[PDB]
Amino acid sequence: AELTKITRGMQNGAETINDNLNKLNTITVQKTGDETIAGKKTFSGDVSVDGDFTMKKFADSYVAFFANKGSGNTVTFTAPWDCTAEV
Amino acid sequence: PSGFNVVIEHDSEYQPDVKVTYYKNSIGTEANGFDTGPVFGGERIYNLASSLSYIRNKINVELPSVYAMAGEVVNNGNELLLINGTEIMRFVIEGATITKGYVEKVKPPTNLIVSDVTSTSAKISWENG
């Protein structure tokens, strides 16, 4: 967020303080109410969701199927990520 | 008399330092309400030369008589404020907590003279502060 600097002797001190408080209040993610958060959010620590968790393309980014069409004797594939296989 | 004296009572068993500043129209002292002054945040800050003396738990901040002012005393623990309308005289303590602060009204006696001294007695005379 781009806040306007509050300096000694400035003009429009009250309004600039008001606008800055209003900017912070509308741009921040808060501990209450329904919200929509944009941007790539990377969480360092643990994350727990007590309510209903919902995600996009789960089966595509977690489940991968590789089989041999022409023989069916030996399957050769380049693992898309770190995983557990069920052959 | 000697000057304008501000008493600062603290919790140290020692001699805390005090730094005095003066400034007009800091936030909350403007006459027509918040940010109605000529220099938002406060006009020129002046360092006030003080002469400090100490007794247990009581600092006496002697300032030149010309700075003498009335006003509400605010104790913020780390600093004391003497607020008179638009004017503020700020006292910053170092190494202790301000317990109570006030302009010295009851002032100590001065020219102590011992006269009519005998083997069994003496007369002590003085002048009001």
Say if residue B49 is in the same domain as residue B87. Answer: yes
Shortest distance between the Cα of B49 and any Cα of chain A, in A, equals 24
Structural domain for B10, as ranges: 1-106
What is the count of structural domains for chain B? 2
Please give the residue of chain B at the shortest CA–CA distance from A14: B35
Count other C-beta atoms under 10 Å from residue B115's C-beta.
Answer: 8
Q: What is the DSSP string of chain B?
A: ---EEEEEEES-SS--EEEEEEEES-TT--TTSTT-SSSTT-S--EEEP-EEEEETTEEEEEE-GGG----EEEE-SSEEEEEETTEEEEEEEESS-EEEEEE--SPPP---EEES--SS--EEE----
Do B20 and B8 have their domain in common? yes
Greatest Cα-to-Cα distance within chain A, rounded to the nearest angstrom: 82
| Quoted resolution (Å) | 2.9
Question: From CA A11, how far away is CA B65, in angstroms rounded?
Answer: 36
Whether residues B95 and B114 share a domain: the answer is no
Asked if B40 has any chain A CB less than 8 Å from its own CB, the reply is: yes
Q: Assess contact for A48 and A57: CB atoms under 8 A.
A: no
**What is the layout of strands, in order, in the sheet containing B87-94?**
B46-48, B17-24, B87-94, B79-84, B72-75
Q: How was this structure determined?
A: X-ray
Give φ, ψ of B29 to 5 degrees. -110, -5
- B101 C-beta neighbours (distance < 10 Å), count: 22
Subunit contact B41:A14, Cβ cutoff 8 A: no
Whether B17 has its CB under 8 Å from any CB of chain A: the answer is no
Q: Are residues B93 and B67 in the same domain?
A: yes
Question: Which structure tokens are listed for B61?
Answer: 């901040």
| A85: region left, alpha or beta (phi > 0 left; psi from -120 to 50 alpha) | beta
Asked whether the beta carbons of residue B39 and residue A8 sit closer than 8 angstroms, the reply is yes
Do residues B115 and B17 make contact, with C-beta atoms less than 8 angstroms apart? no
- Say yes or no: A26 contacts chain B, CB-CB below 8 A: no
SS3 labels along chain A: CCCCCCCCCCCCHHHHHHHHHHHHHHHCCCCCCCCCCCCCCCCCCCCCCCCCCCCCCHHHHHCCCCCCCCCCCCCCCCCCCCCCCCC
Same domain flag for B43 and B71: yes
Q: Are residues B28 and B73 in the same domain?
A: yes
Structure tokens given for B102? 């006030």
Q: Is A8 on the interface with B (CB under 8 A)?
A: yes
* Residue written as token pair 């913020």: B76
